[PDB]
Structure 1
Amino acid sequence: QDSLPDTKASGPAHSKEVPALTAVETGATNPLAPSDTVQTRHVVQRRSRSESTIESFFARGACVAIIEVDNEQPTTRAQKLFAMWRITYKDTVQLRRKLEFFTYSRFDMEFTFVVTANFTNANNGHALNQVYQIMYIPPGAPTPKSWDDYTWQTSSNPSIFYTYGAAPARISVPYVGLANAYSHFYDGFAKVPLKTDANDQIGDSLYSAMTVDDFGVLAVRVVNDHNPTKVTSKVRIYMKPKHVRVWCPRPPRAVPYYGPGVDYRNNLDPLSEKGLTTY
């Protein structure tokens, strides 16, 4: 049973008890029900808050990133034969704003990968089905310089081998934070400038940034050797928090996001024009 409270039948009043009057200076919100200020009937309440539970509010796979990777002939100028993405919920706005209703969080994370591909050029023959490698590289591990160098041997790093056309790839991740909860907001620095420092560059940090690499990166490549004709692919990453817990509520972001921190730049006018005595 998760239903809300029944409305109580309430009659007329002529008393020294005054629930309608209060003082919001105290910091508290007046605990009033309709029966405190109007005559009410008895209602047996069946409605429920099942869908607004923290889990139910976040129980949805959100698009957090679009990684583009090519399979073509290895030439000698900059190419996308492999790609790397810094793991974050912040290249996208939607889930970011939902998570930001709270200061701290703790959860397991589900990653789902939708992979799409197409032909780039009108025609140089075709391509056989591609296998994609998605390698997790935790902070410290060697990062690839080349689409097929030794790092891809992935002996200790976790990797997904996705076959094109198969159902979207899916994995789960534990609560991997260094703290007892994830900090959606960090008012402070990773370094302090000391009076005894040589340059004053030594103690300079980014405000509100914590560890430099936070959760590491995802390195994506096409395992197949190149066809004559070029194939371009995109890996869309869907992120879902599960077994979620949250602490300290915050006002929602009201103006557009300007990078990873609380910084605003413009469209600082969220509210519309409406006349005071206009319905």
Structure 2
Amino acid sequence: MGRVADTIARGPSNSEQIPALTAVETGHTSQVDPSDTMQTRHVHNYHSRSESSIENFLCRSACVIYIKYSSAESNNLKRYAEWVINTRQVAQLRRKMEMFTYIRCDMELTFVITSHQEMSTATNSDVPVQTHQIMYVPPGGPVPTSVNDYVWQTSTNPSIFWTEGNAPPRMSIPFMSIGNAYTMFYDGWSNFSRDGIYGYNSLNNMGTIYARHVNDSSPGGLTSTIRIYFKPKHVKAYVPRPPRLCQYKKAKNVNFDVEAVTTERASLVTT
């Protein structure tokens, strides 16, 4: 279990014991309980730290991107969409993972794929139920340049085929870093010269997702938008860091704008 400490009954004291006094010049932080600073009763305490595990904290699906593509190519979305895999284009999921320096985990990817009708000068629409492909292309694979090209044959590339009006499709991904954990922060460079990309984006090379309609275009236009959700599973995290204080600027840098530590108060004494 994850059950917390009980309070221990304590009486009056008058001794040379000094639990309250300490030096904080040591890296050590005090271990004092209420049973050291006042009377206290015995409390049998059944509260658990069950949901404050890192495998419950990080284990809820979070949207990491959405990308759009259009049958008509109505508003410059092409007939397929692409996304270079990263976790840093969204504030919320990024912040949770950046409370740790190294994380090894498996992922679970869920896709929520929706479509909508577009304005057109077309008359009479009775468009069949759309099918969509989501193709994962590992680093150094051939890439789509059109919706019709040979790369969508998926002979070794992992791929999902899914039809609208069905449960969101999902696939597990295993741990797959070159290292023994994913690196959230890298204080190095990509060159021995100490030039080029600086930061964690040096070590980012996680392939690219491509997504298209599998159906041929119909006389109107449909735009489909695919939202990608990652959930960490089976997590071990190492080296705790402060939570972010500043809002992010960029998905490849930590650059930040100088921001206040805390919010205002009127004075030292407030009620």
Displacement of 1:154 in angstroms is 0.7
Residues 189, 199 of structure 2: 8 Å contact kept: yes
SS of the residue 1:26 aligns to: coil
2:264 maps to 1:273: yes
Task: Compute the displacement of 1:159 (Å).
Answer: 0.5
Query: In the superposition, relative to structure 1, how do residues 78 and 231 fare at CA in structure 2: closer, same or farther (>3 Å)?
Result: closer
Q: Residue 134 of structure 1 contacts residue 159 of structure 1 at CA under 8 Å; is this kept in 2?
A: yes
Relative distance call for 1:137 and 1:240 in structure 2 (3 A) is same
Please show how residues 124-163 of structure 1 align to structure 2 within 5 Å: 124-126=123-125, 127-163=127-163
Q: 1:102 to 1:59 in 2, by over 3 A?
A: same
**Aligned counterparts of 2:156 and 2:83: Cα–Cα separation in 1:** 19
Task: Tell me how many residue pairs correspond in the alignment.
Answer: 267
Q: How does 1:168-179 map to 2 (within 5 A)?
A: 168-179=168-179
1:230 aligns to 2:221 (yes or no): yes
- State the shift of 1:125 in Å: 2.3
Per the alignment, residue 12 of structure 2 pairs with 12
Residue 124 of structure 1 deviates from its aligned partner by 3.0
Q: Write the letter of the residue equivalent to 2:268.
A: L
One-letter amino acid matched to 2:17: E
Tell which deviates more after alignment, 155-164 or 122-131.
Answer: 122-131
CA distance in 2, matches of 1:212, 1:139: 13
CA deviation digits over 1:39-83, x for unaligned, max 9? Answer: 0001111100000011011111000011101112x79x9552011
RMSD: 1.7
Cα distance in 1 for partners of 2:204, 2:94 equals 19
Structure 1 runs not aligned, ≥5 long = 194-202
**Structure 1 residue aligned with 2:79:** 81
Q: Percent identity?
A: 46
Aligned partners of 2:51, 2:42: CA distance in 1, in Å?
Answer: 25
Aligned partner of 1:2: which letter?
G
Amino acid at match of 2:253: G
Change over 3 Å in CA distance of 1:124–1:59 after alignment to 2:
same
SS at match of 1:236: strand
Structure 1 position 162, deviation (Å)? 1.3
Partner of 1:32: 32
Q: Secondary structure at 1:51's aligned position in 2?
A: helix
CA-to-aligned-CA distance 1:153-193 (integer Å, 9 cap, x gap): 11000011111111101110000000000100000011122
The question of whether the paired residues in 2 share the 8 Å contact of 1:112 and 1:238 is answered with: yes
Structure 1 CA distance, aligned partners of 2:261 and 2:123? 51
- 1:206 paired with 2:200, answer no
Separation (CA, whole Å) in 2 of partners of 1:51 and 1:209: 29
Q: What is the aligned partner in structure 1 of residue 97 from structure 2?
A: 99
- Provide the C-alpha distance between the structure 1 equivalents of 2:90 and 2:39, rounded to a whole number of angstroms: 49
Tell me if structure 1 keeps the 8 A contact 2:68–2:77. Answer: no
Provide the residue aligned with 1:244 in structure 2: 235
Question: Which runs of 5 or more residues in structure 2 are unaligned?
Answer: none
TM (norm. structure 1) is 0.91
Alpha carbons 1:190, 1:209 under 8 Å: kept? no
- Measure the CA separation in 2 of the matches of 1:42 and 1:115: 55
Stretch moving more, 114-123 or 86-95: 114-123
Partner Cα separation in structure 1 for residue 160 and residue 213 of structure 2: 12
Partner of 1:111: 109
**Alpha-carbon distance, 1:2 to partner:** 2.9
The structural deviation recorded for 1:13 is 0.5
Give the Cα separation in 1 of the matches to 2:203 and 2:230.
22
Indicate conservation of the 8 Å contact 2:86/2:204, yes or no.
no
TM-score, scaled relative to structure 2: 0.94
